PDB file of N, CA and C in Angstrom:
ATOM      1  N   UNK A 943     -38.300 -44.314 -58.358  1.00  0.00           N
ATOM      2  CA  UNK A 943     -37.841 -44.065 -57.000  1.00  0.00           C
ATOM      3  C   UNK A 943     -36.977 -42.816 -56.886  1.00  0.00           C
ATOM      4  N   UNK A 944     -36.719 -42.339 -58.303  1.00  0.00           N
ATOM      5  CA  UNK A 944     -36.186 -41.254 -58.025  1.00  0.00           C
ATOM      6  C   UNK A 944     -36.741 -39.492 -57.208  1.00  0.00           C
ATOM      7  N   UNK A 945     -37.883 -39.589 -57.178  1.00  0.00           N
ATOM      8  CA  UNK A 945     -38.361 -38.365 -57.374  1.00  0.00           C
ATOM      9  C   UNK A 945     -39.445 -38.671 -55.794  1.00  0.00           C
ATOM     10  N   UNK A 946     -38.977 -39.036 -54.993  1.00  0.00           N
ATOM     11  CA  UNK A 946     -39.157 -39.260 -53.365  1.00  0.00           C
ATOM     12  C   UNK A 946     -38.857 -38.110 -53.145  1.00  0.00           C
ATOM     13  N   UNK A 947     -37.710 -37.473 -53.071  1.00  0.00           N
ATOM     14  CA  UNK A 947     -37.611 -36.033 -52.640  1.00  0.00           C
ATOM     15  C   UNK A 947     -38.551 -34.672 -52.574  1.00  0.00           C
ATOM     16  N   UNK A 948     -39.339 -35.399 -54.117  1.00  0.00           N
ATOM     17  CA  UNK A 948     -40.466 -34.242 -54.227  1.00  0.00           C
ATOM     18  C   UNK A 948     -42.031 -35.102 -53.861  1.00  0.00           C
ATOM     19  N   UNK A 949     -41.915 -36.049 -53.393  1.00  0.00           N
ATOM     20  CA  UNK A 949     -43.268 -37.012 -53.331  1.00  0.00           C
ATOM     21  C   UNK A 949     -43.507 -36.839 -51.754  1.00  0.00           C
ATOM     22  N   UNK A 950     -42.550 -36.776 -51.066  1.00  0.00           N
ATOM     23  CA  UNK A 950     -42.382 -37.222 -49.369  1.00  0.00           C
ATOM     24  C   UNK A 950     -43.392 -35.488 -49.006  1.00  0.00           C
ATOM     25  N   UNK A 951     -42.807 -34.790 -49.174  1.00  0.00           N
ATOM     26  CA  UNK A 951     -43.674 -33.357 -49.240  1.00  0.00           C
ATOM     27  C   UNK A 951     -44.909 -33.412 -49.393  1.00  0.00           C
ATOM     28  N   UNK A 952     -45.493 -33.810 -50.688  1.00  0.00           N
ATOM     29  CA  UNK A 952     -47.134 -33.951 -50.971  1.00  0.00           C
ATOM     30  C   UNK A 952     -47.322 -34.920 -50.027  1.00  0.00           C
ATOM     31  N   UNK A 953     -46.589 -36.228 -49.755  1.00  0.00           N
ATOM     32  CA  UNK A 953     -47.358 -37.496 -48.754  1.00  0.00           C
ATOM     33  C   UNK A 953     -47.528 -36.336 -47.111  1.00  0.00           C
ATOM     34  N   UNK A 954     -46.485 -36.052 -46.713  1.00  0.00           N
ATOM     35  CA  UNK A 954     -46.722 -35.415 -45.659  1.00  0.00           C
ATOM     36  C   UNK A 954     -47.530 -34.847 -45.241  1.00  0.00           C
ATOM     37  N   UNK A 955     -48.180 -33.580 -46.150  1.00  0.00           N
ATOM     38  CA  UNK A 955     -49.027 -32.199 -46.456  1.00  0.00           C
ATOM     39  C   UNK A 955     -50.682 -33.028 -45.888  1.00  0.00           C
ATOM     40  N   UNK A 956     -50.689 -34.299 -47.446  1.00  0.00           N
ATOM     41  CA  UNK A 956     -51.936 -35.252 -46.912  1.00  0.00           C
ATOM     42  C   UNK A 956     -52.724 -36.216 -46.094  1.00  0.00           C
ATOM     43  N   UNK A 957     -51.111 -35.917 -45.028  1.00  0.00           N
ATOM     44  CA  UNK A 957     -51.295 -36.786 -44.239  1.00  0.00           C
ATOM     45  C   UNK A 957     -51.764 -36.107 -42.587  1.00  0.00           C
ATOM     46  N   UNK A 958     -51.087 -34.772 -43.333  1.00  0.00           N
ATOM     47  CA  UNK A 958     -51.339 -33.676 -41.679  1.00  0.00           C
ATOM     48  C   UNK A 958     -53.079 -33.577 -41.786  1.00  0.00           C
ATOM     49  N   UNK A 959     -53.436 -32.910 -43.132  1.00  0.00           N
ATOM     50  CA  UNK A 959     -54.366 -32.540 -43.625  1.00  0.00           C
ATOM     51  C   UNK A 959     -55.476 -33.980 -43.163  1.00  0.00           C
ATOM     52  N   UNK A 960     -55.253 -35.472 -43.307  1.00  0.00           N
ATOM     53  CA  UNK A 960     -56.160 -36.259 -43.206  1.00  0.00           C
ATOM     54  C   UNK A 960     -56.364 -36.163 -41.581  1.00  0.00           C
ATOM     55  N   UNK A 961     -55.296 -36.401 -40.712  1.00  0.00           N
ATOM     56  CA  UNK A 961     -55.248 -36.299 -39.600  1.00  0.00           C
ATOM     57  C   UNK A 961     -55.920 -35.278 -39.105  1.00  0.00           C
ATOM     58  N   UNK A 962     -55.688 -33.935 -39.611  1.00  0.00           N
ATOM     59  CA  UNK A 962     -56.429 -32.951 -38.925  1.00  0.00           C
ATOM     60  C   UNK A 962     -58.515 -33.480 -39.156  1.00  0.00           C
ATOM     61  N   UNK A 963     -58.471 -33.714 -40.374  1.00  0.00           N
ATOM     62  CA  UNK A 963     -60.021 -33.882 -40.386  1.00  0.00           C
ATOM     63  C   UNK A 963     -60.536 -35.245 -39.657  1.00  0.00           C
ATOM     64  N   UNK A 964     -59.490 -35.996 -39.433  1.00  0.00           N
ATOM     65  CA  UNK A 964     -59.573 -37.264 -39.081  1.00  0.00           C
ATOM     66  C   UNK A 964     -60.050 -37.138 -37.436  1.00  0.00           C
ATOM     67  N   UNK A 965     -59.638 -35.470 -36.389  1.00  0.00           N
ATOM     68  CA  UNK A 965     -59.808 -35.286 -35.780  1.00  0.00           C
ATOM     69  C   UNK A 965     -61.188 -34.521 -35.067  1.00  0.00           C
ATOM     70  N   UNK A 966     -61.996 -34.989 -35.947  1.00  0.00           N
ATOM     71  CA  UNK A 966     -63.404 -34.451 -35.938  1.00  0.00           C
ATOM     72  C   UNK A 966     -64.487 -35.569 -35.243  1.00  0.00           C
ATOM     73  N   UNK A 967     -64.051 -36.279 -35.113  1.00  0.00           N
ATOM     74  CA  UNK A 967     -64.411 -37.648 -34.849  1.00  0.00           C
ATOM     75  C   UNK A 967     -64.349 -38.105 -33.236  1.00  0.00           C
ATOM     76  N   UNK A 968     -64.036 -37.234 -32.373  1.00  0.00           N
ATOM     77  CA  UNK A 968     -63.486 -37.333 -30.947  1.00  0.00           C
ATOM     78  C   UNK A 968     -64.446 -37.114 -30.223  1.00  0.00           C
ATOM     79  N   UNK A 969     -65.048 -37.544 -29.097  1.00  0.00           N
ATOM     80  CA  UNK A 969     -65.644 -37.234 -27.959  1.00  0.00           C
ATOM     81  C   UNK A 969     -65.383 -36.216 -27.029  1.00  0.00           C
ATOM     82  N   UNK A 970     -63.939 -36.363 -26.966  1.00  0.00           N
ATOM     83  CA  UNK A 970     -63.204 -35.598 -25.870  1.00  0.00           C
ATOM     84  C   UNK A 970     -63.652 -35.249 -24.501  1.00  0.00           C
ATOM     85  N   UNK A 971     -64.646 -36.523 -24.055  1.00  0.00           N
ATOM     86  CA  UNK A 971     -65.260 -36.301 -22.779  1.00  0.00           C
ATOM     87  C   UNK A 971     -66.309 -36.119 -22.987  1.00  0.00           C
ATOM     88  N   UNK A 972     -66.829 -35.776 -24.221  1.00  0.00           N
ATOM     89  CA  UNK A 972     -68.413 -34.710 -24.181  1.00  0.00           C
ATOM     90  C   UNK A 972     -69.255 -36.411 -24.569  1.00  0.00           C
ATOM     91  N   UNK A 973     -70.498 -36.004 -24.508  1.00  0.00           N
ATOM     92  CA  UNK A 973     -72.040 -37.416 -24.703  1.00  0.00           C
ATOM     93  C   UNK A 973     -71.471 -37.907 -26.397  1.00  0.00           C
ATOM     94  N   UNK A 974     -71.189 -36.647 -27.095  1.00  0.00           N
ATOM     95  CA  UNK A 974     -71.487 -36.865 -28.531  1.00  0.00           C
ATOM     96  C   UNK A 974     -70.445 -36.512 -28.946  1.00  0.00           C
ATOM     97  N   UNK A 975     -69.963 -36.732 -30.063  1.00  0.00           N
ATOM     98  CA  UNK A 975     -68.982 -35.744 -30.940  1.00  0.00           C
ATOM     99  C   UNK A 975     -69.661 -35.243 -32.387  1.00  0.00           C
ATOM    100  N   UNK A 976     -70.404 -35.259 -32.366  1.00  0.00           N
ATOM    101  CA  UNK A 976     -71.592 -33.895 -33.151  1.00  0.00           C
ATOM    102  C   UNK A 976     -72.165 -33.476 -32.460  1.00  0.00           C
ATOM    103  N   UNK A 977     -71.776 -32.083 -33.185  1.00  0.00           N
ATOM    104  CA  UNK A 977     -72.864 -31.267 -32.806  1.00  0.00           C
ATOM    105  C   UNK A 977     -73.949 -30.622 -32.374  1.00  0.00           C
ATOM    106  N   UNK A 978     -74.902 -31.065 -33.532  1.00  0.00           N
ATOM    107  CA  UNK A 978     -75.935 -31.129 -33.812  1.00  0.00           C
ATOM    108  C   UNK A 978     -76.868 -32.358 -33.161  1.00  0.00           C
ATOM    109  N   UNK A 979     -76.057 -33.413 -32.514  1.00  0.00           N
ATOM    110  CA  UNK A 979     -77.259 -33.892 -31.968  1.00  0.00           C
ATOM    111  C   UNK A 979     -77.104 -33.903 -30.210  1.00  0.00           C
ATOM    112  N   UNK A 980     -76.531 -33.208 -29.554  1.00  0.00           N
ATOM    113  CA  UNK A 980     -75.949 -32.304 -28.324  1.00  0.00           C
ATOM    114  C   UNK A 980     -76.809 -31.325 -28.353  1.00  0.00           C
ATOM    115  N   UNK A 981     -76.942 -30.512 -29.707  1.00  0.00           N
ATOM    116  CA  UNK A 981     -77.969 -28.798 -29.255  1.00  0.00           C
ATOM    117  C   UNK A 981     -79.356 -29.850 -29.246  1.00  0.00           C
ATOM    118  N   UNK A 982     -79.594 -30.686 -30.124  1.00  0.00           N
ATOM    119  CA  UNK A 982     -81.011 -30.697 -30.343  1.00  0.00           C
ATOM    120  C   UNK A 982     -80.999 -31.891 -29.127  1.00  0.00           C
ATOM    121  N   UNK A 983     -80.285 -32.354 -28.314  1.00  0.00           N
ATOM    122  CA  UNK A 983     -80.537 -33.373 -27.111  1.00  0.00           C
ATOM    123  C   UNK A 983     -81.025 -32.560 -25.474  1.00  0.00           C
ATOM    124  N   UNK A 984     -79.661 -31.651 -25.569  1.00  0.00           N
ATOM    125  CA  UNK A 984     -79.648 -30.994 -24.290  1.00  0.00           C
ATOM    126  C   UNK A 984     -80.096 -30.077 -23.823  1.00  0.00           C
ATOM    127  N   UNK A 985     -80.637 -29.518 -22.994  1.00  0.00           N
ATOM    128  CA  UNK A 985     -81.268 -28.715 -22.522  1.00  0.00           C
ATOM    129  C   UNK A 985     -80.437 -27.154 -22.662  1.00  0.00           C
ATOM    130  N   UNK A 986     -80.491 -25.621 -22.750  1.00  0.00           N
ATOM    131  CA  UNK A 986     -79.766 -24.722 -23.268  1.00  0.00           C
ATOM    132  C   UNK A 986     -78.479 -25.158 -21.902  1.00  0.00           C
ATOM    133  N   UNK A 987     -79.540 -24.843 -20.712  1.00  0.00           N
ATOM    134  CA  UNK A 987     -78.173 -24.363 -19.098  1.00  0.00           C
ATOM    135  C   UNK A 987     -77.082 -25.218 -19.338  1.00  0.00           C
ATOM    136  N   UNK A 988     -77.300 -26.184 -19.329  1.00  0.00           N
ATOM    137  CA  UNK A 988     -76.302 -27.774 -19.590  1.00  0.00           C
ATOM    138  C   UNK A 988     -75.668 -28.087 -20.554  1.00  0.00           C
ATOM    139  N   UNK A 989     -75.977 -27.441 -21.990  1.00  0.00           N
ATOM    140  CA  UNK A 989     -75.155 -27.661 -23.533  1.00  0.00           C
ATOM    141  C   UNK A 989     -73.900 -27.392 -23.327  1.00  0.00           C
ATOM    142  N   UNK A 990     -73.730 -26.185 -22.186  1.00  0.00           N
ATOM    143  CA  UNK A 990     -72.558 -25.069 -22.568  1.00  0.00           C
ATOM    144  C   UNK A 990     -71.339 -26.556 -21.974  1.00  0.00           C
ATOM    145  N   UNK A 991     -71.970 -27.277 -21.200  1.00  0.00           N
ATOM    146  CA  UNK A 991     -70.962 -28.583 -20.508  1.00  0.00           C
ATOM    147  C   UNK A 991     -70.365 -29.116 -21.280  1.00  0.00           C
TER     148      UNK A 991
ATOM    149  N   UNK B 348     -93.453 -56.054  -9.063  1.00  0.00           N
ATOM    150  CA  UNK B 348     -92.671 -57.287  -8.175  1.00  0.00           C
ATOM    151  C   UNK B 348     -92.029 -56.949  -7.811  1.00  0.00           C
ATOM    152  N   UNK B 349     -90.956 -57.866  -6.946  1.00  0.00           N
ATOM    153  CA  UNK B 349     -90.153 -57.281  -6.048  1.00  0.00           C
ATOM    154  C   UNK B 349     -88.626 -56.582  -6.398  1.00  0.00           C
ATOM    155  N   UNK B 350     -87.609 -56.607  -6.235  1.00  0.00           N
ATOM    156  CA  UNK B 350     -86.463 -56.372  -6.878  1.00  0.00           C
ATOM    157  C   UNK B 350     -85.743 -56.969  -6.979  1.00  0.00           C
ATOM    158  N   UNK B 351     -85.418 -58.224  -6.435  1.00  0.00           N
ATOM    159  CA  UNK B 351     -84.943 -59.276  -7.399  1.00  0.00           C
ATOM    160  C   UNK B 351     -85.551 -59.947  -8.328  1.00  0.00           C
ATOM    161  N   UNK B 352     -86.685 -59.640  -8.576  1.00  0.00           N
ATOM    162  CA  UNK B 352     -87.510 -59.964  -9.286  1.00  0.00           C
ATOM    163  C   UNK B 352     -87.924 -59.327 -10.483  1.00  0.00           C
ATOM    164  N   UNK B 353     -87.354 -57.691 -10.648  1.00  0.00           N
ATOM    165  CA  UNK B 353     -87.998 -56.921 -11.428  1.00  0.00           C
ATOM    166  C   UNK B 353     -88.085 -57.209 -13.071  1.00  0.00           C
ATOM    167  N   UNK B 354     -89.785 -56.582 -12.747  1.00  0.00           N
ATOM    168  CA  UNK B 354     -90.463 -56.236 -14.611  1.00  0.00           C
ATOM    169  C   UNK B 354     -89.448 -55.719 -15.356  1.00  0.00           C
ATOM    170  N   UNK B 355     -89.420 -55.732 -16.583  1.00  0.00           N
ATOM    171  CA  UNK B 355     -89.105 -55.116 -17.846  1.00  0.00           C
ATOM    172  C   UNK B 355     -89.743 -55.409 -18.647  1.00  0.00           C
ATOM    173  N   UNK B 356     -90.510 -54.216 -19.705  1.00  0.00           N
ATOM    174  CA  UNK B 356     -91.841 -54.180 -19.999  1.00  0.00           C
ATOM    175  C   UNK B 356     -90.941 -53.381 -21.818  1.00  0.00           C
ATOM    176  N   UNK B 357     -91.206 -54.366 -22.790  1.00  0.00           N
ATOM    177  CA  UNK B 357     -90.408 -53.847 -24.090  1.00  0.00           C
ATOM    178  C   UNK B 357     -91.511 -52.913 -24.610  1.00  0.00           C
ATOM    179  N   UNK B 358     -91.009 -51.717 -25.239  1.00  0.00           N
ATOM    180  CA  UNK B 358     -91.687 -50.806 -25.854  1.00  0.00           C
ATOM    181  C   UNK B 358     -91.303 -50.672 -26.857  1.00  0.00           C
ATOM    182  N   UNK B 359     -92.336 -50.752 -28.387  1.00  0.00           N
ATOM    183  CA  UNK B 359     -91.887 -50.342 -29.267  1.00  0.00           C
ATOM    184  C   UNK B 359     -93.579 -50.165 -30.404  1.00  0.00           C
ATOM    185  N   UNK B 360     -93.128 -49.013 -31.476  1.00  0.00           N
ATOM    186  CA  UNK B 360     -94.387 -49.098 -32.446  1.00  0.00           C
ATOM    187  C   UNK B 360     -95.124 -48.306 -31.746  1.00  0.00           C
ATOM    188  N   UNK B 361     -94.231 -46.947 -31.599  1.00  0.00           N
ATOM    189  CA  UNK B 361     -95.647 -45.933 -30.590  1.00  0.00           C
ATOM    190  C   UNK B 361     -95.506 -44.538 -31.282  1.00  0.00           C
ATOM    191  N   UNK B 362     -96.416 -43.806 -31.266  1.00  0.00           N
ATOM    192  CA  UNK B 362     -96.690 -42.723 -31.225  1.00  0.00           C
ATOM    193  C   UNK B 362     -96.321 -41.708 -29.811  1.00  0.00           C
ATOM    194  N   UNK B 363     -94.986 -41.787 -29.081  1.00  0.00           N
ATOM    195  CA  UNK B 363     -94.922 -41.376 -27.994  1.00  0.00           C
ATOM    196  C   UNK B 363     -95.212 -39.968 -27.405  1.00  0.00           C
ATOM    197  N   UNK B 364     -96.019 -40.005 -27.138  1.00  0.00           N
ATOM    198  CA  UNK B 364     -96.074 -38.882 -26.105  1.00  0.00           C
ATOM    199  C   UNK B 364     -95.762 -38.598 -24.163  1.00  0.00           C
ATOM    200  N   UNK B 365     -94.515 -37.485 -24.168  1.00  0.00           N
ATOM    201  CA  UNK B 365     -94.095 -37.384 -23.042  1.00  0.00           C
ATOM    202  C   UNK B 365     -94.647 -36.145 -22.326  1.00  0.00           C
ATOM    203  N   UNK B 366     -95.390 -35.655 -22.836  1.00  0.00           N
ATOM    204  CA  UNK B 366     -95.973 -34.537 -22.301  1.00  0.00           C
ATOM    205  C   UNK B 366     -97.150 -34.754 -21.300  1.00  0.00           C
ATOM    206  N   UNK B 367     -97.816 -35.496 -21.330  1.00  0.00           N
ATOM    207  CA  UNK B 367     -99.058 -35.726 -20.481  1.00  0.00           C
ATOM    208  C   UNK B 367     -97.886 -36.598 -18.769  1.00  0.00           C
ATOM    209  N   UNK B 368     -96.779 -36.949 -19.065  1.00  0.00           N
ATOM    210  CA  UNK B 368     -96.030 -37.361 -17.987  1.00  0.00           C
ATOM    211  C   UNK B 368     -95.418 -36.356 -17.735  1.00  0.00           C
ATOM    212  N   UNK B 369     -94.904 -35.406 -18.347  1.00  0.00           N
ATOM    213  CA  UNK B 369     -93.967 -34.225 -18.071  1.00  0.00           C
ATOM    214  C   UNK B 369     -95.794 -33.116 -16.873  1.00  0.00           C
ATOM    215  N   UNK B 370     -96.091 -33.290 -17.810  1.00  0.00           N
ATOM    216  CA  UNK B 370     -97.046 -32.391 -17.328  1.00  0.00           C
ATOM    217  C   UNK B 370     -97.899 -32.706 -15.986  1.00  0.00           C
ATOM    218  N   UNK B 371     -98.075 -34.397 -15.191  1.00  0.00           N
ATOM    219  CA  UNK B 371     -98.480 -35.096 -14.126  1.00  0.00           C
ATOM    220  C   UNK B 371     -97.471 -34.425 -12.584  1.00  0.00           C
ATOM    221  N   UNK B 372     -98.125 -34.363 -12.041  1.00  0.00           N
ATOM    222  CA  UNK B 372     -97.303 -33.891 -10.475  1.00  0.00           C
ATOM    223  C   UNK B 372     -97.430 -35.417  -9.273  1.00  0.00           C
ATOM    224  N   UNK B 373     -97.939 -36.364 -10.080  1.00  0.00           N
ATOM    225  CA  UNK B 373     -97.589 -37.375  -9.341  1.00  0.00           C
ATOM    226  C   UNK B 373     -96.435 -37.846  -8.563  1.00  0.00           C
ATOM    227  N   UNK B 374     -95.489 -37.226  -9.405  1.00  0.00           N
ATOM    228  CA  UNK B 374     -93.931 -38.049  -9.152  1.00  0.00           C
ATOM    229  C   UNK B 374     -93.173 -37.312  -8.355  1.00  0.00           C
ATOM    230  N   UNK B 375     -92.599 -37.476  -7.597  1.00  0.00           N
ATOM    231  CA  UNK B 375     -91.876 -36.768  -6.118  1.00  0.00           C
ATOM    232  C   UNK B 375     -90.491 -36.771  -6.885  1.00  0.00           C
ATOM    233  N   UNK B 376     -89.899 -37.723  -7.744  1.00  0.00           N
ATOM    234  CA  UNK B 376     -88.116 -37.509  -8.313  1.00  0.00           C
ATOM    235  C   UNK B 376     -88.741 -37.731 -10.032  1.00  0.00           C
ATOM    236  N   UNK B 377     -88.153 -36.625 -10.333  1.00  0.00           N
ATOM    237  CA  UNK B 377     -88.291 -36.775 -12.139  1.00  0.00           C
ATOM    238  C   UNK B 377     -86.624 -36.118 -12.681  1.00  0.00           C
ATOM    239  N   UNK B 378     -86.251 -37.013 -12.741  1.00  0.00           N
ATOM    240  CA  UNK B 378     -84.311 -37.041 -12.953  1.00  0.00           C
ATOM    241  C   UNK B 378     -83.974 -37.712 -14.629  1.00  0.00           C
ATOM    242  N   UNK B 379     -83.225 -36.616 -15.419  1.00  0.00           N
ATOM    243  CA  UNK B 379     -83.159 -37.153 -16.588  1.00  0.00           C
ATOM    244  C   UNK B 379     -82.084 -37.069 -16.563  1.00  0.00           C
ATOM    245  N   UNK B 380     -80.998 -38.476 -17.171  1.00  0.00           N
ATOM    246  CA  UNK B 380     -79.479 -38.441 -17.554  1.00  0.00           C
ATOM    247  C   UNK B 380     -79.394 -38.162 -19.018  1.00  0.00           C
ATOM    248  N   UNK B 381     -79.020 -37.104 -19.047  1.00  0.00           N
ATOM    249  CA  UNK B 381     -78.280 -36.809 -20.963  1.00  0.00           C
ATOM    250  C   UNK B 381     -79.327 -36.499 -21.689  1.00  0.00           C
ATOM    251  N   UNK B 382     -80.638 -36.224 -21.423  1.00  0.00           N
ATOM    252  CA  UNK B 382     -81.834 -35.757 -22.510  1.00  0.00           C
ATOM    253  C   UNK B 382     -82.582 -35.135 -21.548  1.00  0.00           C
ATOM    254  N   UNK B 383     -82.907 -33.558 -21.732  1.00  0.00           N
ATOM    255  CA  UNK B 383     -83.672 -32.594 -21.546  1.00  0.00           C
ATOM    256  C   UNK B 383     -85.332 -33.367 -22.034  1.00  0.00           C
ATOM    257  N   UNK B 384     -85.967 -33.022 -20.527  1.00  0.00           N
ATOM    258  CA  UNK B 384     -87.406 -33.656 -20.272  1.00  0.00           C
ATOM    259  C   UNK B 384     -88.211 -33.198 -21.646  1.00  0.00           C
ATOM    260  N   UNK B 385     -87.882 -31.657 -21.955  1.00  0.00           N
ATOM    261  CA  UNK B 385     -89.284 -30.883 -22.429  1.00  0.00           C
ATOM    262  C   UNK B 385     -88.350 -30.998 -24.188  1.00  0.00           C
ATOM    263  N   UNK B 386     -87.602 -31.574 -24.235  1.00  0.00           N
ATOM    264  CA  UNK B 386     -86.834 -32.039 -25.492  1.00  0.00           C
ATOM    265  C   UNK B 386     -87.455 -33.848 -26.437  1.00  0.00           C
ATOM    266  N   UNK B 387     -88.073 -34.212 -25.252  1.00  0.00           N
ATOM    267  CA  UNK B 387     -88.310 -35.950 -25.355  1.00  0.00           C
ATOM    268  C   UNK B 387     -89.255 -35.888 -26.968  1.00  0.00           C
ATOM    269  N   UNK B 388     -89.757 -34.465 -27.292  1.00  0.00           N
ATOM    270  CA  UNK B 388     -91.349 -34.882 -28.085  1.00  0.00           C
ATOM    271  C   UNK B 388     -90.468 -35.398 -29.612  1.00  0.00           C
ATOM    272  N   UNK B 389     -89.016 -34.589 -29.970  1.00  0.00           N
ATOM    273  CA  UNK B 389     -89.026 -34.334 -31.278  1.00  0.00           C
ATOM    274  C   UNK B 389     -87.933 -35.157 -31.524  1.00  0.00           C
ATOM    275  N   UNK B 390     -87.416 -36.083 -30.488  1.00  0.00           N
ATOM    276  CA  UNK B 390     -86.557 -37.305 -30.890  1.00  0.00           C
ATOM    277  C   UNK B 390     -86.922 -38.499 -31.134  1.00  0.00           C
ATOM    278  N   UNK B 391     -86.376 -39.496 -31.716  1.00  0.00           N
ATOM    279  CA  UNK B 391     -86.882 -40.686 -32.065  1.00  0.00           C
ATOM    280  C   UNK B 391     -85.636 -41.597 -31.733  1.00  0.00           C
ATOM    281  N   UNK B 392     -86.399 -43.156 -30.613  1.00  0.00           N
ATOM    282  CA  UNK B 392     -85.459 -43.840 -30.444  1.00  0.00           C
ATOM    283  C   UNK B 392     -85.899 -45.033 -31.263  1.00  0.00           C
ATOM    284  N   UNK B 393     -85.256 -45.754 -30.792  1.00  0.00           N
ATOM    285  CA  UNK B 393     -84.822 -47.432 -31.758  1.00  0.00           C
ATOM    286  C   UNK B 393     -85.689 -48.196 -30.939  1.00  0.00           C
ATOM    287  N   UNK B 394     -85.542 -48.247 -29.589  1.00  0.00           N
ATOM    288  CA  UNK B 394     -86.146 -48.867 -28.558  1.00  0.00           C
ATOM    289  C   UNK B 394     -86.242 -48.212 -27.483  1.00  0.00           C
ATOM    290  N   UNK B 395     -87.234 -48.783 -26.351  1.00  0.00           N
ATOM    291  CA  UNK B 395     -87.218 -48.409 -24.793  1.00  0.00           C
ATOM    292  C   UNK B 395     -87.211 -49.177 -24.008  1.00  0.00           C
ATOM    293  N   UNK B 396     -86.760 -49.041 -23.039  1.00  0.00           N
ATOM    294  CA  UNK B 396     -86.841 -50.396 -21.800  1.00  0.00           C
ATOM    295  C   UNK B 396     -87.977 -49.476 -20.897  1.00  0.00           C
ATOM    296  N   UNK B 397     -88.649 -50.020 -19.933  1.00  0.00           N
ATOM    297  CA  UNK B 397     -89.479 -49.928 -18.537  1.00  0.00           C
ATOM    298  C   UNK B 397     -89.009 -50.706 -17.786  1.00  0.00           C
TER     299      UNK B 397
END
C-alpha cells in the first residue's frame, strides 16, 4: 500500500485512455455508430446527416 | 383485407431481388426510411415483414 502515490497515475492515464476508446461506441443521434455500415446503407445526399 | 384486419406475409430463404420493383412505375409513393432504394441489392437481412 505503499507505493499508491506512483500507482494512482498509471490507474488514471488507463482509465482516461479506456474511456476515451470506450467512446466509440455512441450513436450520438446518428442510425448507427459505425461507420461503415451508414456509407454502405445510405444513400451519398443523406450520409453527410 | 381490411385494416383492422391486416395481412402479414413472413419472408424468408430468398434470393432477393429489388430491382425489377425499383425499376416498375406502378407505384404512385415509393418512400424509404434509413436504406437507400438502389442500395437494397448488396445488403442482407435476418428477416422481412409484408
Amino acid at each position: 500500500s505503499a507505493l499508491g502515490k506512483l500507482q494512482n497515475v498509471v490507474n488514471q492515464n488507463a482509465q482516461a485512455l479506456n474511456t476515451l476508446v470506450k467512446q466509440l461506441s455512441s450513436n450520438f443521434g446518428a442510425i448507427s455508430s459505425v461507420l461503415n455500415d451508414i456509407l454502405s446503407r445510405l444513400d451519398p445526399p443523406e450520409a453527410e446527416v | 383485407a381490411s385494416v383492422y384486419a391486416w395481412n402479414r406475409k413472413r419472408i424468408s430463404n430468398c434470393v432477393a431481388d429489388y430491382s425489377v420493383l425499383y425499376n416498375s412505375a406502378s407505384f404512385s409513393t415509393f418512400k424509404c426510411y434509413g436504406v437507400s432504394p438502389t442500395k437494397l441489392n448488396d445488403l442482407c437481412f435476418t428477416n422481412v415483414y409484408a
